[PDB]
Design a binder for this molecule. Structure first.
Ligand SMILES: [Cl-]
Ligand SMILES: [Cl-]
Ligand SMILES: [Cl-]
Ligand SMILES: [Cl-]
Length: 150
């Protein structure tokens, strides 16, 4: 996990980027995942959250896509949380509803069972923390590189 300070920093940036993405300002060509996600929402919503400028939005989008494309589930969770603004409970409840049976090595032997809501919620928290951990060095380097050259 990121430090507390790294986490506050990256979380703030991803809140601004998520509002920017949600407003529809990312070219579909920049990320098939984000484009499909934005298709899946509801048009006609008002904007209630501040966003970053377009340069920062594009940069963060490029970073996020280059890191998260490998794990479409984690990417979608990240977008639900930051772009759609869905709570962690809402995200976890969706995945609980659609969860597949799992092989669980419980005390005494294995059994087949779908995961509990608490399990799904813990996993959503873990996935968000892991995504931020993977994004952080790439975004930090991206901002630093931009300033260094420009
Ligand atoms: Cl910064
Ligand atoms: Cl909004
Ligand atoms: Cl087995
Ligand atoms: Cl469980």
């Amino acid at each position: 996990n990121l430090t507390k300070e790294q986490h506050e920093w990256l979380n703030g940036w991803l809140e601004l980027w998520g509002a920017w993405v949600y407003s529809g300002r990312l070219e579909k060509r920049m990320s098939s995942v984000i484009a499909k996600f934005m298709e899946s929402v509801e048009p006609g919503r008002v904007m209630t959250r501040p966003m970053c400028n377009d340069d920062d939005g594009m940069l963060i989008s490029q970073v996020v896509d280059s890191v998260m494309y490998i794990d479409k589930k984690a990417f979608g969770i990240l977008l639900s949380y930051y772009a759609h603004g869905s709570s962690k409970h809402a995200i976890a409840s969706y995945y609980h509803r659609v969860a597949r049976p799992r092989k669980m090595l419980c005390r005494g032997g294995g059994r087949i069972q779908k995961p509990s809501l608490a399990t799904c919620r813990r996993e959503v928290d873990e996935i968000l923390n892991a995504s931020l951990f993977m994004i952080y060095p790439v975004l930090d380097s991206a901002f630093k590189n931009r300033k260094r050259v420009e």
